[PDB]
Enzyme design. Structure first.
Site, PDB file in Angstrom:
ATOM      1  N   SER A 162       0.834  -1.196   0.000  1.00  0.00           N
ATOM      2  CA  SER A 162       0.000   0.000   0.000  1.00  0.00           C
ATOM      3  C   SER A 162       0.881   1.263   0.000  1.00  0.00           C
ATOM      4  CB  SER A 162      -0.956  -0.049   1.216  1.00  0.00           C
ATOM      5  OG  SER A 162      -1.959   0.955   1.167  1.00  0.00           O
ATOM      6  N   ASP A 324      -8.590  -2.954  -6.602  1.00  0.00           N
ATOM      7  CA  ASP A 324      -8.554  -3.912  -5.498  1.00  0.00           C
ATOM      8  C   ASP A 324      -9.435  -3.531  -4.317  1.00  0.00           C
ATOM      9  OD1 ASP A 324      -7.246  -1.966  -4.050  1.00  0.00           O
ATOM     10  OD2 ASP A 324      -5.313  -2.994  -3.953  1.00  0.00           O
ATOM     11  N   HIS A 356      -7.434  -5.410  -1.439  1.00  0.00           N
ATOM     12  CA  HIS A 356      -6.258  -4.640  -1.031  1.00  0.00           C
ATOM     13  C   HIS A 356      -5.488  -5.178   0.186  1.00  0.00           C
ATOM     14  CE1 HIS A 356      -3.766  -1.044  -0.985  1.00  0.00           C
ATOM     15  NE2 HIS A 356      -4.084  -0.823   0.278  1.00  0.00           N
TER      16      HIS A 356
END
Ligand SMILES: *[C@@H]1O[C@H](CO)[C@@H](O)[C@H](O)[C@H]1NC(C)=O
Ligand SMILES: *[C@@H]1O[C@H](CO)[C@@H](O)[C@H](O)[C@H]1NC(C)=O
Ligand SMILES: *[C@@H]1O[C@H](CO)[C@@H](O)[C@H](O)[C@H]1NC(C)=O
Ligand SMILES: *[C@@H]1O[C@H](CO)[C@@H](O)[C@H](O)[C@H]1NC(C)=O
Length: 376
Positions: A162, A324, A356
């Site tokens: 991320s 995602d 994600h």
């Protein structure tokens, strides 16, 4: 197998705080503590009766004169576990499944012969800040990588999730090519928000509690706005069209050229100053200059734009695109652009149906990492 450094995303490692405050926002808030305590993640601090205390301690204060953030008066916040893995494996030191983050991945690494704190190490940081206010972190990261190279006998593999990918890109862009050629084996990029994410607009406007539903959206918005890293991740023009409308209202549209207006209109002008401080940190086109594996999720509805009847709107209406769930699919076009700008290989890997956060504990993700590390 090569040494591995793990770089987390937003909310992705423990934080600790110590208090000696002159004043508090309500009587149930502690003024003083004798030692540091865990301020993220500790579920008991987020109950309705005391969430205001937590907000008052974990918020950053923006100083317009210095163009820098500071902690509230009498609050210190530190990052535990640098060089270790515990503080990114579990966000809650009770080790509850709610906070399990890098744990599944580290368990796999250990099963393959890695050792916590030796040839697999975490690089946690104060994720409320953007790279401009985490200089010492990057120095420590460079030193740790050099040490691991020497101790374990080869270049290191960086694995980032991320926002950790943007931290890692910043770092690599600022190291000389000769340093990277010696010390970095590969960069495995998981769910990277290259060029920012559309959902940041909703976070700033009306709050986003989907990650922590025990906090009401308008309450958690206070923390999310105060974090420089939130404004840093607003959409960029190297990924998105300058004419794309991210927020529509009956009287005005906000595109990425309209952030100053947006911040005025939601009642948070400091956010514009934060965006100005951070928008230039990562060079738009410059590749990391190392072997790169870009892993990105698809097939999950991902917020793309919003309709608000005004600000503040309880429920904005949401338009969804591909990605995602958090990172829009367009971010993965950024790795494609890098293929022609660096000599090191850039491998794209689609992860269809991978959300994600879930991608970090997913067997397909781990199988890919195994191939990178063990060669088979
Ligand atoms: C803001 O920063 C300036 C200069 O760094 C400093 O003089 C001042 O104490 C700061 N303001 C607050 C409210 O702490
Ligand atoms: C891209 O955005 C930056 C600010 O983030 C700006 O300085 C630059 O002019 C923009 N490029 C365009 C609009 O082509
Ligand atoms: C944004 O407003 C403009 C007004 O000139 C309008 O033409 C456009 O359709 C609006 N937004 C979108 C997503 O089309
Ligand atoms: C794991 O990720 C793959 C995509 O690589 C996806 O097809 C699958 O749904 C995921 N598994 C779980 C349990 O979420």
């Amino acid at each position: 197998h090569p040494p591995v450094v793990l770089v987390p995303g937003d909310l992705g490692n423990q934080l600790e705080a110590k208090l000696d405050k002159p004043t508090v926002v309500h009587y149930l808030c502690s003024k003083k503590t004798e030692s540091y305590f865990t301020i993220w993640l500790n579920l008991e601090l987020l109950l309705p009766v005391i969430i205001d205390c937590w907000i008052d301690n974990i918020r950053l204060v923006y100083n317009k004169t210095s163009r820098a953030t500071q902690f509230p008066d009498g609050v210190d916040v530190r990052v535990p576990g640098f060089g270790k893995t515990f503080s990114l494996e579990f966000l809650d030191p009770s080790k509850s499944s709610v906070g399990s983050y890098f744990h599944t991945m580290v368990e796999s690494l250990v099963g393959w012969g890695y050792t916590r704190g030796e040839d697999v190490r975490g690089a946690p940081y104060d994720w409320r800040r953007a790279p401009n206010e985490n200089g010492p972190y990057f120095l420590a990261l460079r030193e740790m990588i050099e040490e691991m190279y020497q101790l374990y006998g080869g270049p290191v593999v960086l694995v980032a999730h991320s926002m950790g990918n943007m931290y890692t890109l910043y770092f690599l862009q600022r190291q000389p090519q000769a340093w990277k050629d010696k010390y970095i084996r590969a960069f495995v990029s998981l769910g990277a928000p290259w060029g920012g994410v559309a959902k940041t607009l909703r976070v700033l406007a009306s709050g986003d509690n989907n990650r922590i539903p025990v906090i009401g959206p308008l309450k958690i918005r206070e923390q999310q706005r105060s974090a420089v890293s939130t404004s840093w991740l607003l959409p960029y023009n190297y990924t998105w069209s300058p004419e794309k409308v991210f927020v529509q209202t009956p009287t005005i549209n906000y595109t990425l050229r309209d952030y100053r207006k947006f911040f005025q209109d939601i009642g948070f002008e400091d956010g514009w100053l934060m965006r100005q401080d951070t928008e230039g940190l990562v060079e738009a086109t410059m590749p990391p200059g190392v072997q790169l594996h870009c892993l990105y999720g698809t097939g999950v509805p991902t917020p793309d734009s919003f309709y608000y009847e005004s600000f503040p709107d309880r429920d904005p209406k949401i338009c969804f695109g591909d990605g995602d769930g958090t990172v829009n699919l367009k971010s993965a076009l950024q790795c494609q652009a890098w293929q022609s700008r660096q000599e090191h290989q850039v491998l794209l890997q689609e992860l269809p149906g991978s959300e994600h956060i879930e991608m970090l504990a997913n067997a397909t993700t781990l199988a890919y990492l195994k191939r990178v590390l063990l060669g088979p």
